[PDB]
Paper text:
Given the intrinsic linkage between Zn2+ ion coordination and catalytic activity, we were unable to crystallize our protein with Asp-[name]–modified GcvH-L or a peptide containing the modification. Therefore, we synthesized asparagine-ADP-ribose (Asn-[name]) as close, nonhydrolyzable isostere for structural studies. Having synthesized Asn-[name], we were able to crystallize the MorMacro:Asn-[name] complex. The overall structure closely resembles the [name]-bound form (RMSD 0.515 Å over 245 Cα). The [name] moiety placement is isostructural to our SpyMacro:[name] complex with zinc(II) contact made by the Nδ2 atom of the modified Asn side chain, which again leads to a tetrahedral coordination of the Zn2+ ion. We could observe an isostructural water molecule in our structures of SpyMacro and MorMacro in complex with [name] and Asn-[name], respectively, thus suggesting that the Pα phosphate group could act as Lewis base in the reaction.
In some pathogenic microbes, the response to oxidative stress is controlled by a SirTM/zinc-containing macrodomain (Zn-Macro) pair responsible for establishment and removal of the modification, respectively. Strikingly, however, the “catalytic loop” found in all other MacroD-type enzymes (also termed “loop 1”) is replaced with and extended loop containing the zinc-coordinating Cx(4)HxC motif, here termed the Zn-loop. To gain a closer understanding of the functional role of the 3α-bundle and coordinated Zn2+ ion, we solved structures from the three sub-branches of Zn-Macros namely from S. aureus (SauMacro), [name] (MorMacro), and macrodomain-fused SirTM protein (Mfs1) from Fusarium oxysporum f.sp. cubense race 1 (Foc1Mfs1) in their apo form as well as of S. pyogenes (SpyMacro) and MorMacro bound to ADP-ribose ([name]). In all structures, the Zn2+ ion is tetrahedrally coordinated with three metal-coordination residues within the Zn-loop, while the fourth coordination-contact is exchangeable and is provided by either [name], a water molecule, or a symmetry-related protomer within the crystal.
Numbering used by the authors: -1 to 260
């Protein structure tokens, strides 16, 4: 009969355990049981899975998505021209496309429960995301360079597409080279160019390179804003709304000062 919420969750865990030959007792709460699935999903290198698993995975995750506090693009009220500014979780936002800050293998994040945007996006979207990116890397025959863009379905997310870009990474101790500036520009240009070719009306960016890859937050923002404006000045595009989705208070405050002059 109709497997309810707990019965679906408890199925999926057992599946991934039995494919790695073990079993640990199922924790008490819903919350701890939920993190075990995340953990098992994050850790699973790409390969075939049963259509039964996908179907049920999709029912479970779509439901979770539908029960969050979703935000529509037309409901963001802070805007300057086609640019909007918004603080919130990119997995709650109904844009045509969201941008993922990814790595050169484009497989997402293998640490259980890490809070990088790559893990967060793959954990809400589903295993199909890793599988689709893996088919694209295999056909390309080679890792993805910094500053390009690739597009995929968004699966159980509330958006339609995900755009994957790999930003530059700043070694601990070193200052930012003119070459690193140019590469982070190219991330923004590639993502705009791709969404333009797909004729999308809205895209949401995260603050690429500013977490694990350790780019200074203020300098990143000056670049992101100048690049987006030069692109909108210089091209025709179907884009009406380009959303800087910021996650930390400090990035909110940085972006707010530079866009809305105090
Ligand atoms: N929900 C959210 N919505 C909006 N913005 C958010 C959200 N959450 C965070 N964010 C924000 O997204 C921005 C992007 O930060 P970020 O660290 O995700 O990305 P970054 O571009 O600076 O770095 C990307 C790299 O690290 C990952 N890799 C790992 O984590 C692997 C590891 N080093 C290993 O040893 O195994 C990933 O595969 C790639 O390799 C930040 O401003 C957060 O506040
Ligand atoms: Zn509109
Ligand atoms: Zn991570
Ligand atoms: Zn193209």
């Amino acid at each position: 009969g109709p497997m309810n919420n707990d019965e679906q969750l408890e199925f999926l865990i057992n599946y991934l355990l039995d494919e790695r030959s073990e079993s640990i007792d199922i924790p008490k709460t819903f919350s701890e049981k939920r993190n075990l699935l995340r953990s098992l999903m994050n850790m699973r290198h790409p390969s075939n899975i049963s259509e039964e698993f996908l179907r049920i995975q999709d029912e479970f995750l779509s439901r979770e998505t539908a029960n969050k506090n979703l935000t529509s693009v037309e409901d963001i009220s802070l805007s300057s021209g086609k640019i909007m500014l918004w603080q919130g979780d990119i997995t709650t936002l109904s844009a045509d496309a969201i941008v993922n800050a990814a790595n050169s293998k484009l497989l997402g994040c293998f640490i259980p429960m890490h809070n990088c945007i790559d893990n967060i996006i793959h954990s809400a979207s589903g295993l199909q995301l890793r599988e689709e990116c893996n088919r694209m890397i295999m056909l390309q025959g080679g890792d993805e360079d910094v500053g390009k863009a690739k597009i995929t379905n968004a699966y159980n997310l509330p958006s339609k597409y995900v755009v994957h870009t790999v930003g530059p990474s700043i070694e601990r101790g070193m200052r930012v080279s003119s070459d690193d500036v140019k590469k982070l520009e190219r991330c923004y240009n590639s993502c705009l160019e791709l969404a333009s070719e797909y004729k999308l009306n809205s895209i949401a960016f995260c603050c690429i390179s500013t977490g694990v890859f350790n780019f200074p937050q203020k300098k990143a923002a000056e670049i992101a804003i100048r690049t987006v404006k030069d692109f909108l000045n210089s091209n025709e595009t179907s884009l009406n709304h380009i959303i800087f989705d910021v996650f930390t208070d400090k990035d909110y405050d940085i972006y707010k000062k530079l866009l809305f002059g105090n």
